[model samples]
Target chain A: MKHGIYYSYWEHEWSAKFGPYIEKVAKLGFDIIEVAAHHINEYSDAELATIRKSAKDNGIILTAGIGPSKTKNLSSEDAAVRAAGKAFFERTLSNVAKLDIHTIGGALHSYWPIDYSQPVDKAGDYARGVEGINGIADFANDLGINLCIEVLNRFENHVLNTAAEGVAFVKDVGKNNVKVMLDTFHMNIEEDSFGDAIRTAGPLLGHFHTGESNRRVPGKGRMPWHEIGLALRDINYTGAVIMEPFVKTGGTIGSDIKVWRDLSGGADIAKMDEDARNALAFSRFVLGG
Target chain B: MKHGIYYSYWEHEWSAKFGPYIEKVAKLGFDIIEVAAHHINEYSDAELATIRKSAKDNGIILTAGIGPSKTKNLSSEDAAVRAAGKAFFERTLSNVAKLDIHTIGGALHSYWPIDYSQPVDKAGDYARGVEGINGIADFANDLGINLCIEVLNRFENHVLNTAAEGVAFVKDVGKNNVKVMLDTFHMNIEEDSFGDAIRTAGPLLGHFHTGESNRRVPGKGRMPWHEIGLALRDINYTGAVIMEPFVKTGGTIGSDIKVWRDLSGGADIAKMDEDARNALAFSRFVLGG
Candidate 1:
C-alpha cells in the first residue's frame, strides 16, 4: 500500500522533543513518510538523514519535497520577483536532493492567477507558471529528483485549480522533472469529480495528496472516493497516497486549524491516529496503492 | 460502555434499502442508541417499540428523543408561532410517553437562537422558550418524562448558546420535566472548556451528546472530549452519554453535513462496526458511563 503522511518541518520539531512521535506514528502502522521540504534549511543533513533512516528502518518509503508555500507577486512587471521565486525553488531543490527522495512536490514558486480580480489570461498565468516550473525543473532533473506540481483551489494557490491545468502547465513547461500531484482537498473544493480528474491526469499524476473531500485523512468526505481509488486502480497509478489532511495535529500542524474544528477529539495524533489508519486502510483496500 | 449513533428521519429512508443499518451499527459493538424521535415516528408505534426492543436485546440503550420537528420560534411575540411550536413539543412528548425513556431531546419546542446576531435575553426568547418548555414540562411531569433541553449553538438553534442557557431555560420553565443536554460540538465552538461546562451545568445536565469535537465520531476531533468524559465522571453524571457522531460505513462520516465536499477515502460509515467498537472503548476508557 502507498501509505504516507503529508507532514511538515514544524512537526519534525515536535518529533525531536517527543523523540518517539514519528516512531509512534509508524507503530500505529503508517508505511511511508511524505514530508514538505520548506524547512529543509532548519534541519541539518544529520537530522534529515535521521528522519530518512527512521522511515527506512521502519520499512516505510520516504518521499520528501517542497510544497504548498505562498508566492507573492512582488513585481510581475519586473524580473526580480520571478528570479527570487526561481531562487527559492532552487534552494528547495537543493534541500530535497539532500533528502535523497527521487521526487519532490509543492507550491514553492510564486502562486499563479497573478491577478484574478482583473480578467486573467489563462495563457499568461500558464506561461508564468511554466517560467516558475522551468526555473527548477532542469536542476531537479539533473539532481535525479522529479518535481511534482500540485494543483490548489483558488483560495490556496491561485495558479492551478485543477489536474487538467497542472497537466497543461507541465505540458507547457515540457520538463521531464515536472509531474502533477492531485490533492483531493483542493480537488474536492474545485474539481467536479476527483476520479475524472485523476483519469484526466493519467501517468502525469505523480504524487497524491491523499485526503478526503473534507480535507480529512481520507474516508472522511463526501466524494465518491472509491471510484477515484478504483480509477487509480484501473490506471495502475501506483503513486504515494500521502495523507495530507487539511486538519492539523497541534502547534506543528497549523495555528488556525484546530482539532475540534475538524473533529471532535482532542488535537493529538493519538486522537487522530485511528481515523487516519482507517482512511489509509480504505484507500489501500480500493486503490491497492 | 455507551456507544450510540444519531438516528434521524433521513436515515430511515436510507436504511430501508440497506436493511437496518442499525443492526450493523449494533454489531459494531455499540450498546446505546440515540433515537431521533422523528426517525422512530416513521416506524409504526409498534415498529418504534420493536426498534426499542431490538436495541435493548442487542444491549443498546435508546438515549435521547430525536424530534417533534418544530422550525419556528417558540418564544415569538406572535402567540400562534409559540402555540405551533408548543404543539410540536407536545407531540414530541407524546411520542416519548410510549418509549418509557425519560430524556426527550432534539429541537422539540422550537428552532434555536431567536437569532445568532442577537444576545440571548431570558425574558425575550426565553419567555417563548419557556412557553414551549412550560407546556412540555407540564406534559413531561404528567407523563413522567424528563425532558432534556439541548442548548444548540447559534447555528443549530437560536434560543440557547451555552449549557448555562440550556440549564437556565430548563430552570425558568419551572418543571422537573426539563433538564439540560450538552453537545461537545456546540460547546467546543461556543464554550471555553468542555469539562468546565459540564461541571457548571451540574445536576441540571440530564443528557450529553458524545461526538468528537471534529464532528466526526468520538475519536476524530481535538475536542478535549476526554475531558468531557472525565468531567462527567468527576461530577458523577449518570445521564445518558448519547453518541451523536455523524457516521458513514466505508465512506467518510462528514457527508452527513458537507454533502458536496471531497475527502480522502470512503467516509461512508457502512462499515462503522469497528468505529463503534472504538467509540465504546474510548467511552469506557474515559467516561465510565
Candidate 2:
C-alpha cells in the first residue's frame, strides 16, 4: 500500500525537529512524503538534495511537494489577492520543477486566507477560481509539472466545501496539467466517505492522503479504511497514498491527539503507535497496491 | 419559519449566556429554541429555569432536548458505556416532560465513536450498535417525546456518513417517536446535492436545521437557499426550520458586514441590511409560508 504523511505547514515546531521526525514516520512504514512547501518557499539546492537523499536512503518515495502558488486566485475580486495567488503559482512551479515529484498538492488554485466574502456567489467565485487555475495549469503544462488541487474543509476554507464542488471546479478548469487530490481528513470534514469522494473526483484524482476522520495518524478516527481501499481499487486509482497529517498546529488540526482521542482507548504513546501500525497494515492489506 | 440557536452542552461557553443571548437571537426575528443537550448537563435548575423564562418571555417555542448515548461505540468492549447510555433516555424524557419540549434529539443510537484505533472494521460494530440502539428506542417509546436522530457530518461522528445512513439508522430504530433531524451544515459535507438530501430524507425527517453551504449566515454562502426551501416544500416537510448556525463561533454576525459592503456596490450598512432583509423576505416568499 502507498502510505504517506503530509509535510504539514501548520506544524512549524516539528520542522525544527527535522530528520528524526521523518525517520520515526518512516519507521511507522509510510512509503511516501508530501513535502509541505510552507517549509521552504524558496528552497536551496542543498536542501532539496538532502530531502531527496533521505527518502531514497529510507526507500520512501517522494510522492509530491506542497508548493504555494504565487498566482492570482481566479475567484478573487481583489486584484492584489489575485496577484499574490498568481505569484504563488510561479514560485510553486519553480520549486517543484527541480524535484522528482510527480504532483504537488494542497489548497492551491483559488483564493487564500479562506475566502467567504459576500456578493461573490459560488458560480462567480468558481468561474474566477477556474480562470486563475487555468493560468497555473498552462504553466504546469509548459514546465512538465502536474498540479493537484486540494480542497480545504469548511473549517479551513469556504471556496471548495465538498468533493462535488471540487469535481465541478476541476471539470470547469478542464486542464490536462491539473487534477484533484482527495485527503481523507478533508473528506471527513467535507464528503460522506473517501470512497464517495474518489468516485466523485473519478479520473481527475491523481493523489490521495490517508488521515483518520480526526487529523491524527491513520486508523485513529472513524474512516472506513478497508472500504476506501476497495473503492480505490475498484476505480483503479493508482495514486500516491501520502500521509499528510498534523503533529501539532495552533489549534489548526484541532489537537495534538485530536477529537478522536476521547474515543480511542487513551491516546497514549503505546496505543497511538499501535493504532498507526494497524492502520498501515490495513491500508496495505485492503487498499492492495 | 421557526428559527433558533443551538444551546448545547458541547458549547459550554454559551450555556451560561443562554438567558442573555436568547433575547439577542429573538430580536433577530427568531421564533423557536433548539435546546441541544450540549450544555443541559451543565445548567443548574435556576439556569434551566432562566432559559425557559427567556423563551417564554420572547414567545419562543421550546422544541427539543438532546439525549446522547455512546454505549454502541465500535471500540467499546465495556458494557458500562452502554448502560450509561440508558441514563440519557431517562434524563432526556424527564427533561422534555419537564421543559415542555416536544422532541428528544442526538447521536445516541449509532455505535458511535467508530473505532479509529488503526485497522477500522464496521461489520462487528454495526451489529452491536443496532442491538444497543434498540435498547435506547424502548426508552423513547415510554417517553412519548419524539426522538429525532440527527445525522452528523463525517467529521463529527460515524461512518454512516450520509442522509441515507442517518435515515437508515432512524428506520432501524423504528419507534413512533423516532424520526430524522437533517442539518443543512452536515448535508453540505455529506450529500452530493442539498436538494437530493432533502428529497431522499423526505418522510423520515422530523425537523431540519437550515444553514448556508459555507455554514455562514443565510444568503452569504454557496448554497442556494430558495432551492433548498423549494425542496423542503416539495418533500411535504412542514417541520421546524431551525437556524441553529455557528453565527460567531469565530466571531459575530456583524463582522460579516465588512464582506457584505464589498459584495454590494460599495453601499454602506443601510443598503446591506436592506439587501439581507430582502433576501430573507424573498426566501419566505418563495417557500410560500
Candidate 3:
C-alpha cells in the first residue's frame, strides 16, 4: 500500500492550493498526497495541467477527497438535487481526469454534515444514492476513477455508517468504479471491530483514511492500529493509506470538522509537519512496512 | 462494584421523575438507581421523602447524576457565573442529603452542551473548576457525599476528557469528597486503553458509566469489557458500575444526545426493559459474577 497524507494536515482551509504540496509530500517521504476534490474541481484547465505535471515530476501520486455539499446531495429526496449532484460529479470528474487523479473518496452516497432535524427516509435516500451512482458509473469508469463511498460516522451522516452497509450499497450499485472507503476516525465511533470492518470491506475497499480516534495524527491517539493493520493485511488491501488528521481550531476546517478544542495544542506548522512525518513512519511501522 | 443505571435510560427527557424508577431498577436486578440530580432538585419535600421511602423499601441505593446548565456553569471565566454554579450545587446537595444519596456524578465542573462558537479559556476555566469544587467539597464531605466529576468527551465539555486529566483535576482540588468519573463511551473516544484509563484513575474513580461506544447496552456493541474488568480488578474498584445507554430517538434525550438514527430500531418500553434486564445480567456476568 502507498502511504500518503492529506494536504489539509497543514492548511487551515480545505481548498488550499495543491501545487506547492507535490514536492513537500515527496520530501516528507510520502508516496501519495491526497488533495481536496473541490480544490482540484475549482482549478482551471491550465492549472490542472500544471498541478498534474508537478505531481508527476515529484514522483507523488495525487488523489482527491470530497464531501458532497447539501445542495448537490446524491441521496436527496428532491430529484433535481440528485440530478444536480450527478452534474457536479461529472464536472468534478472532468477536472479529475485532466489531473490524472484515479481515486475520489468521500460521502458521495449522502451529503456531508447532514441536518437530521427532519425525519430522514434512509431507505428512499439509499435507493436514490444507488440510482444516482449508476447514472454516473460509466463516466467515472471511463475516466479510470474509483468513486470510493466513505462510510461516515452516525454523527456526520446517517445513510451508511457501517462497512457492511457501504459494501451492500456499493454492491447494489454494481459498478466497477464504486467501492467502499473506510476511515479510522469514523470507524472508531461506529464499527464494532476495525478488523471486522476492514475484513468485510475486503476487495471492495478502494480508498482508506487513517487517523486517531480524536482526529489527531495517526498513532498519536487511541485507535487499534495493530488490529487495523492485521485486518488490512488479511484483506491484502493495495490502496493508498492516507492520514487525514484535522487538528487546528478556528477556521472553515475547524468549524466543519467540529474541532471544539485545539487537539494539536496550538501546534505550529513545523510541529504539525514533524507529527505527520512521525505518523507516516509509525503508520508504515505498525500498518505496512 | 455495585451495579446501577441512570433513570433517563428509560425516559426521553433528562429531568424525568425518580419516584417511578426506585423499584424498576431494583426489579431489573440493579443494586442502585441513579436519579437525575435536577429531578430531585425540583422535587418538593414530600415528593423527596416519598421517593426515598420507595428506594429504601426496595433495598436500592439512590444516587444522582447531573450536567450543570450553561447559566450555572462551575468553570465559567466569570466569577459571578461560577458563584451561581456553586449555589446551584448547594441547593442540589441540600436535596441530595434528604434522599440519602451518597454519590452524584456528571460535568459539574463545566456546563453541558457548551457553545464553542467563541473561544474557550481552558486554563482559566480549569483553574476556576478546581476553585469551584473546593467551595462545595466540605459541604459534600459533611453530608457523606462524593461529587464524581465526569471526564466528558471533548465534544461535550473541554475541561477534562481523560481519566488521567480527571484524576489530576480532582487531586488539584485537594478534597477527599471529590473524585473522577469514567465512562466507557467517552474513553472509547479519548483514552488509549481501557485498562490504562481504569488503572490511572484507580482509587480516584468514584463512578463508572458503562455503555457501548455507540451508547447502546454495554454488551450490545464493541467495548473492551474484558480489559475493563481486568482493570477494575487491578484497582479493586468498590464503587458503582452503572450502565448509561441512551438508544432511543425523538425528544430532549434524542436531541441532547444527538441521536440522529433510531439506534433502538423503534424499540418500545417492553423491548427496552427487556434489553436493560439482559444488559444488567450481561454486565454482571462479564464485570463481576
Candidate 4:
C-alpha cells in the first residue's frame, strides 16, 4: 500500500520545474509522484534526467497521467481521429517508458471532459473503445507499462462511467496490461455502494485515485474510508493510492475541473502539503499500511 | 402560448433538407422550430431561403440555441477567450436576426458541459460572465433578440445550476434583453420545488424548455406538468416552450449527448411523432392553449 500525490496540486507551476516539487513531495513522505503525461513533453532530456535522479535520490517512484483531447479520442468513430489518438497514446507510452514509470492511468478509453451535446451510441462506442484499448495495450505491454482506465462520473464521460462497466470493458479488451482504475470522487456519484464497487473490481483494480467527495484531500469530506480499506485488504490489493484533489489555483486545469472555491482552505503550498499529510495519515489508518 | 420542438429529433437527417421537417413541424401543431446556432452555419443561402420560406408557409416561428465551446467561453479568465465568446454571441445574434428570430437561448454564461475536474473561481468567473453578458446584451438589444441564459443541471455547468442563480445572474447583468431560461429536464434534478422555481423566476424568465424529467417528450414521464403550467400562467409567462429530448439516432449529436439506449421506445419516426403530438396536446391542456 504505497501512497502517492498527483502533481496537479501545484497546477501550472508543477511543470515549470520538477526537482523542487519532487523534493517537497519526498520530504512530505509521499512514496510516488504522479505527473501529467502531456506536460512530460515540456521537459528536455537534461530536465528529465534531473527529475529522474531527484526522485530516485528521494526514494520516490514516478507515474504518469493522461486525458486525451477531442482530436486524440481513441473511441472516435472517424478513422483519422482514432489514428491520432492511437499515435498520442503510443507517444505517451514511450515517454512513460523513458521516465522509468511502470504505470500510467486516466480516461484512456476515450477523450476526457466529453461534450454531452453530441449524441451517444453506447454499444458502438464501447466496441470502438475496446478495439482501441487492445491496440494500445500491446504497445504499452512492450514498454513494460500498464495502462489503467479510470472510471469517471457520467457528466465527464459516456464510456465506462462505473466500476462494473470498466471491468466489463477491460474484460472485453482481454489484455494482460489493460486494467481498471477507480477514483473515489467519481464513485461517490455513480456507484450504488463504494465498498461493493471496489469488491467488484477485485484484482483488476490496478490503480486507485484516493480523494474526498468534494475533490478535496481525503478525510476532509464524507467517504466510507474504513469500508474502502477493508475491501482493498480483502482483495489483497497492492497498488498506489494517489491523491488527486483539484484545489483552486485559477489555472486552466482548475477552470476545467470547476473548482469554484478553495477546498485547500489556504492558497499556499504549505497548506496543500498539510492537507496531503492528513490524507496520507488517514489512508494509512484505513489501509493499515 | 406557442409550443416548439428541437429540430434535433430528426438529428443529422433534418439538416440535409429542412423544408419537409418544417412542414412536418407545422402539420404536427408545433408553432416554432428550434435550431442550434452552430448548425445554422451549415446551411447555404439557398437552403436558408428554402427553410425561411417553408417556415413562413407553415406559419411556424424560429428560435436559436447556443452553448459556447472552450474557445468561446464567456466566463473564461483570459481576456482573449472572453472576446472570442463575445464575438461568437454577436455572430449568433446576427444569424438569429437574419432568421427573423426574436430570442436566443442556452448556456450563454459559461462553456457548456464544463469539466468539474478543473478548479473554479466562482466570484471571478461570475463577474466575468456578467461583464461578458452585459457586453453581448447591447448587441442583442439592438438586434431585438432577447438573450435568455438557460439554467442547466450541476453536471452540465458550474456557473449557474439553479433558477435562483439564473435570476441572480440575469439581475447582475441588469439588461432587459438578457433574461433567464428554465428547462424541466434540468429543473427536475436541481430544483427543490420545480413549480416554485418557475414562480421565482417570474417575469425575468424569457424562455422555457419543456420536457419530461428523463429528457423525453413532455407528458411521457413523471413531471408535474400541471403545476409547471400553473406556474407559467401565474407569472403570465408567454415564452416559447421547446421540447429537447436526447433520443438515440446513431448520429454524431446522439453520440455526444450519450443516448446509450433508444429512448424513442422504438426508433421509428412515426413513434417519435406520436410522442410529440401527445406532448403538444398535453401542453395545450395544461396551459389552455
Candidate 5:
C-alpha cells in the first residue's frame, strides 16, 4: 500500500500553480502527492516539465485529480456540451501523459458539479458519458496512462455513485486501461459495507481517496480505518490511498466543497504541516504500511 | 398534479410535536401537507387522532417523510439494526394507515445519515434493504398505503441517489405498493437532467419533493420548472409535488441540513408565505394545472 495526500491542503499556498508542494509532501513522509489536474491549463509545457522534474528530484510520485465543471459535462444531453467535455478530458489526459503520471482519477465520468438546468437524458446522457470515457480511455491507453474514474457523492455527481454502479460503468466502457476509483468520504454515504464495496470493486479498484466523513484528516474522524485496511488487504490492493482533506483553510477547495467556516481554525501552514504529519502517521499505522 | 410543502417551516413552532402545523399548512392553500414521520412516537393516540382530524377539518391531504437513523438502519449489516429499522417503519406505516394518509416516503431503504464507519454491503445490504422494503410494502398494501422510497442526495444518503437506482431498487423489491420518490434538490446534483430523471422514473415515480438546489421555495432558484412540468405531463404523473424548503427559520431542519445562517433573510413568516404562494402559482402555470 502506498500512502499519499491530495495537494489541496496546500493549494492556496501554491497560488494556483503546482511544484511548490512536492518537496513539502515528501518531507511530511508521504510517498505520493496527488495534485489537481483541472488547473493543468494554467501551466505551460516548460512549467509542467519543471514540475515533473521536481517530483522526480523529491522522490515522490505525482498523481492527478479532476472533476469537470458544467461547461465540460460528459453526461450532457446536448451534443455541444458532450463535445466540450470530451475536449477538456482529452487535453487533461494529454497533460497527464506529458507529466508521465501513470494514473489520473476523479469524477471523470461526468461534470464536477452537475448541471440542473435541464432534465437528464438517462439513455442519451449515460451513453454520452460512457462514450466520452471510452474515447479518453483509448487516448490514455495509448499514452500508457490509466484513466481512473472516481465515484463521487450524490451532491457531486448524478452518475455512478456506488461501487456496483462504478463497476458496471467501467465494464460498459470495456477499456482495460479504464478503472474505478473509490473515495471513503463518498463510500460512507453510498455503500452499505465499506469492506464489501472494496471487495466488490476488487481488481477494478484502481485508486482510492482516503477522505473522512467530515472531510478532515484520517484518524481525526470516525472512518473505520481497521476495516478499510482489512478490505484493501483482502483485495491485495496495491494502489494510492490518497488523503483528500477539504479543510476551511483550503482556498479553492474549501469554496468548492462549501466549507464556509474554519475547519482547521486557520489556513496556517504550520498547523497544516502538523496535521499532515499526524495524518500520514495515522494512515500508515492503520494500513500497516 | 398536487401541490404541497413540508411542514418543516412550522416544525420548530410545534415544539417537537407534529399536529399543530396542519392548520397552517392548510391555510397556505396547498392541496397536500407533508409531516415528519420520525416523530410519530412523540404523539399519543388521542393527539394523533386530533392531528388526523385537523387535516380532515382543513381539507388537506397528509403525507409523511421519514429517514431511519443510526439505530434503525434498514440496510445495516447487523441484523439487529435491520430489525429496528423494520420495526420503526412498520409502526410508522400502521400510523399512516390509521391517519388515512396513503403515502409515506424518504430514504426508507437505509439509515438517514448513513454509517460510513464500514464499507457498504453491496449484495448483503442491498438484499437486506430490499427485503425490508418488500416486507413493509406488503403491510402498506394491506393498509391501502404506498411505501415511497425517496432518493436522497449523496450528502444525506448512499443507498439510492439517482432515479435509475431508485427504479432498480423498487423493481428488485417487486411490490406494487413500493415506489420511488424524487426530490429536485437532490436531482439537481445527481441527475443528468431534472426532466430526464423524472421521465426515467416514469411509472415508478410516486412522490415528488419540489425543492430548489438551495433548499428554498421553487421559482426563487433557477430550477427548470417549465421542463420539469413538461416531463410530468409526458408521464401523466399524478403524484404530490411537495415544496420541501430548508430555510434557517426551519430550526431542526436548518440544523439537520447544516444551515448555520438564515436563508429566509430573517425567518419572516410573511416572506415565506409569499414565497410559497408564488412557488405554487409558478408550478401550476408550468404543469398547466
Candidate 6:
C-alpha cells in the first residue's frame, strides 16, 4: 500500500494551499499527499501545473479532498442548490484532472460538517444525496476520477456513517467510478470492529483515512493500529492510505472540526515535521512496508 | 453510591410496566431500578400503590425515565407540541409521585433518537430547549423531583454530548432542581479524559449511567471503570448509579438501541439474572462498596 498524509495536518485552515506540502511529504518519507480541493476550481492552469510538476519532481502522488460547504451542499432540498453543487463538483473534477489528481474523497454524497441548522430529514436528504451523486458520477468517470464517498462519523454527518452504509450508498449510485472511503476516526465511533468494517468494504474500499480516536496522528493515541493493519491486509487493500489528523485548536479547521484542545503541543514547525515523519514510520511499520 | 439498572435491560419494548421488575432487581442484587414513565399517567392509583409496596417489600427504589416521543418534543417549534410535552411530563411526574419515585431522567429537554426528518437547527433547538425546560423547572421544583439531563452519544441525540457541555447546560438552566447525567458510553466517544469530565460535572451531577463502550454490562468491555470510580470519588458523588445495557437484539429496545447482534449469548432469564447479579458485583467492586 502507498502511505501518505494530508496538507491539513500542518494547517489550521481547511482552505490551505497544497504547493509547499508536495515536497514536504515526499521528503518526510510519504508516498502520496492529499490536498484540499475546494480551491481547485479557482486555480489557474499554470498554478496547478506548477504544483503537479513539483509533486512529480518530488515523486509524490496527489489526491483531492473536499467537504463541500453549505452553499454547495449536494443534498440540499433546494433544486437550485443541487444544480450548483453538481456544477461545483464537475468544475472541481475537471480542474483536479489538470494536476493529475484522479481521486476525490470526503462527503461526496453530501456536505460535510453538516449545517445542523437545516432540517434533519434523513429519509429525504439521503434519497436526494444519492440522486445528486448519481448525477455527478458519470462526469467523474469520464475524467478518470474516482469519486470516493467518505463515511463520516454521526456527529459530522447523518448519511453513510458506517462502511456498510457506504457500500449501500455506492450500490445506490451504481456507477463504476463511485466507491467507498473509510476513516479510522469514524470507524471508532460507528463500526463494531475495525477488521469487520474493512472486510465489509472489501474490494469497494477506494480510499482510506487514518487518525486516532482523538484525531491525533495514527499511532499517537490508543487506536489499534496493528489490528487495523491486519484488517487492511485481510482486505488486500492496495489503495493509498492517507493520514488525516486535526490536532491544533484554532482557525476554521479547528472550530469546524470542534478541536477544543491543541493535540499537537506547542511544537515548532521543525518539531512538528519530526512528529509527522515519525508518524509516517509508524504507519509503514504497522503496514509492514 | 447506590447501584441500579434500567428496566430496558431485560425487555424488548419501551413502555414496560415496572411492577415485574420490582422483585426482579432486588433478587438480582440491584439497589434501584429505573422504569419507563411515559405510561405512568395511565396507571391506576391502586395499581401504583401495590407496585410501590412491592418495591418496598423487595427493598428496591424506583426511578422514572423517558425519551419523549415525536408528538411531545419539548423543543419542537410548534407551541402546541411544547405544551403537550410539558403536560405529559407534569402528568408523568404526578403519577410517579404516586409510586414515590422522585427522580426523572433521560432527554427531559428534547425527544430522543432525534427525528432526523426535522431541520438540524442546533442554534434554534438549543435556545428553545432551554426555554421549554425553564417553563417546567418550577413545576419540577414544586414537586421536589429532580430532572436529570442525560448526555447521550451523538448518534442518539444532538444536544449535550459531553459532561462539560452538560455542566454548561445545567448552568444555563440555573435551576437547583436540574442536574446532569453522564454516561460512560458517551464519555468514551467525546471526553478527552474520564477524570476531567467527572470533575467538570462535579456539583450538578444528579444521576449517573454506567455501561461498557459496546453497550455491554459494565466490566464486560474496555471502559476504564477504575478511573471512572476514582472520578466519582473525586466529586464525592452521592447520587445513584444506573446500569443500562441492551444486549439482546430482537425487539423495540434492541432495534431502537441498534443492538444488531445479541451480546448475551442466548442466556435465559435465569442466566441473565446471574449475569446481572455478577455485574452488580463488578460495579460494587470498582466503586469500593
Every model's DockQ, to 2 decimals? Answer: 0.02, 0.05, 0.43, 0.10, 0.03, 0.14
**Order of models, best TM-score first:** 3, 6, 4, 5, 2, 1
User: Model 4, range A1-289, lDDT digits (tens) per residue?
Assistant: 8888887777644345555778888889888888888877667777778778888899999988888887997888999999999998888788777778999999888886565554566677789989999998988999898989998876677778778889999999999999899998778655657788898999999999977765777787556788899999988888888988876746665566765445566758777778888888888887656
| Cα distance off (Å), candidate 6, residue A65 | 1.5
Error of 1 at A87 (Å): 2.9
Better of 3 and 4 by lDDT: 3
Error of 3 at B87 (Å): 4.0
Q: What is the interface RMSD of each candidate, in Å?
A: 10.9, 10.3, 2.8, 6.6, 16.6, 5.1
> Residue B75: error of model 1 in Å?
51
The alpha-carbon lDDT assigned to residue A260 of candidate 1 equals 39
Calculate each model's fnat, 2 decimals: 0.00, 0.02, 0.51, 0.16, 0.02, 0.09
lDDT of 3 by residue, A1-289 (tens): 8999998878777666868988898989999999888877777899889888988888999899877888897889888888889999999998988988899999888887665545666679889999988889899999998899999877677678889989999999999889999999889887778899999999999999998887889988768789999999999998999999888876678766766567787788788889999999999999995
lDDT of 3 by residue, B1-289 (tens): 8998888888888756668888888998899988788878788999889888988899999888877877897888777888888899998898899999899899878887676655777788899989889889999899999999998776677778888889999999999889999999988887767899999998899989999878989889778788899899899998999898888866788776866566776888989989888988888888884
What is the Å distance of residue A144 in model 5 from its true position?
Answer: 1.1
* lDDT, residue B96, model 1: 61
Go through the candidates in order and give each one's C-alpha lDDT: 0.63, 0.60, 0.86, 0.80, 0.77, 0.81
For residues A8-99, write the lDDT of model 5, one tens digit per residue: 76664434565778888998889999988867767899988998898888899988887777777677767898889888888888988777
Model 4 TM-score (B-chain only) = 0.94
Off by over 4 Å in 3: A75-87, A114-135, A171-174, A220-222, A247-278, A285-289, B13-16, B76-84, B116-121, B260-278, B285-289
Please give the C-alpha DockQ score of model 4: 0.10
lDDT per residue as tens, model 4, B96-160: 67777898998888885555555656778889999889988888999899999998865677778
Better of 3 and 5 by DockQ: 3
Candidate 1's C-alpha runs over 4 A off are A8-21, A68-77, A112-122, A248-262, A267-269, B1-289
lDDT of 1 by residue, B144-175 (tens): 77877777776666667787777777777778
Per-residue lDDT tens digits for candidate 5, residues B1-289, read 8988887764454346657667877887889888877666667788788888888999999888877787986787788888888888778878777678888888888775553333444467668889888877887898888889888665566567678889999999999989999988777655556778899999999998886655667776656788899999899999898988776633445444644334576757788788888888888887655
Q: What are the root-mean-square deviations of the candidates from the true structure over C-alphas?
A: 12.9, 13.5, 3.3, 8.6, 19.7, 6.6
Candidate 2 has a TM-score of 0.52
